[PDB]
Write a protein that binds this ligand. Structure first.
Ligand SMILES: CN1CCCc2ccc(S(N)(=O)=O)cc21
Length: 304
């Protein structure tokens, strides 16, 4: 029993973090086999950041201008190349601690764990969601850049996020491990607008299922609705519209709880239109969209 915003164990990611220094900029890198991945903006001075030409800037840089350190091991750079917004530094030493991994580009509404780092050292771990507008509401100080997000499938680390920058709005933007931004962002220091953020309806339903499973059942009603009808109420409150794949993904939680998905939608419909009134659900006074149906099932069944 209980319900917490739980992060994946970080052990397997901790042994791949390194510090990368070029000129006087230092940030975090990911050391996998014989390659160190990091944000390419490591090569920019301050002036450079307003309007960087990354092709010209990189051409000026030699292997020995890159200082990759793992603890008090100093790795030697023998290669460098730029893949979109990430630098790949080929090093002489393959990471003895490289886990089973792959690079995945996640969709909006998906959750991942962040290992927040400074000078290649891990400082803490948190769970969060890729917002529908391709931002994250992170905790990142200066020199957190190159901090990575990941999931664990069994024994396999799925790397899905690298942190590049904070927007003047205070939210966080970054790339996949192939160097493509999530969202319409560019690694230059210019005023950049994120879209309208929406609430991730499918994740809020997963959370209400979580609440029922954990005793909190005051919000259930005998009312119902169709998708069509429900979705129309959802758009007015800036909730993502709910598809048939969404219903399909909640079927298991539906089966565990003997509450039809549509019946749960009808309870949500009502909460939007009438709110909580000082009631809480799993001790929160707002609706919570940073758990996937898969997160709820894992947490409520005991997956390692
Ligand atoms: C300094 N840096 C690194 C490269 C990308 C980027 C984007 C926006 C900003 S911002 N708006 O915080 O000045 C700063 C930044």
């Amino acid at each position: 029993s209980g319900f917490r915003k739980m992060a994946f164990p970080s052990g397997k990611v901790e042994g791949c973090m390194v510090q990368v220094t070029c000129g006087t900029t230092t940030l975090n890198g990911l050391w996998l086999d014989d390659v160190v991945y990091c944000p390419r903006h490591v090569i920019c001075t301050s002036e450079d950041m307003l309007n960087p030409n990354y092709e010209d800037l990189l051409i000026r840089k030699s292997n020995h201008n890159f200082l990759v350190q793992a603890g008090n091991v100093q790795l030697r750079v023998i290669g460098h190349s730029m893949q979109n917004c990430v630098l790949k530094l080929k090093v002489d030493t393959a990471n003895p601690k490289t886990p089973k991994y792959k690079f995945v580009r996640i969709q909006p509404g998906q959750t991942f764990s962040v290992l927040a780092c400074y000078n290649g050292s891990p400082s803490g771990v948190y769970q969060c969601a890729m917002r529908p507008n391709f931002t994250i509401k992170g905790s990142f100080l200066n020199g957190s850049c190159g901090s990575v997000g990941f999931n664990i499938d069994y024994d396999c680390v799925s790397f899905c996020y690298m942190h590049h920058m904070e927007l003047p709005t205070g939210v966080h933007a970054g790339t996949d491990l192939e160097g493509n931004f999530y969202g319409p962002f560019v690694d230059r220091q210019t005023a950049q607008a994120a879209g309208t953020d929406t609430t991730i309806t499918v994740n809020v339903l997963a959370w209400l299922y979580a609440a029922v499973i954990n005793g909190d059942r005051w919000f259930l009603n005998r009312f119902t609705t169709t998708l069509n009808d429900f979705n129309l109420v959802a758009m007015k409150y800036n909730y993502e519209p709910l598809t048939q794949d969404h219903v399909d993904i909640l079927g298991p939680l539906s089966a565990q709880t003997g509450i039809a998905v549509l019946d749960m939608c009808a309870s949500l419909k009502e909460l939007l239109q009438n709110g909580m009134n000082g009631r809480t659900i799993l001790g929160s006074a707002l609706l919570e969209d940073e758990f996937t149906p898969f997160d709820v099932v894992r947490q409520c069944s005991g997956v390692t």
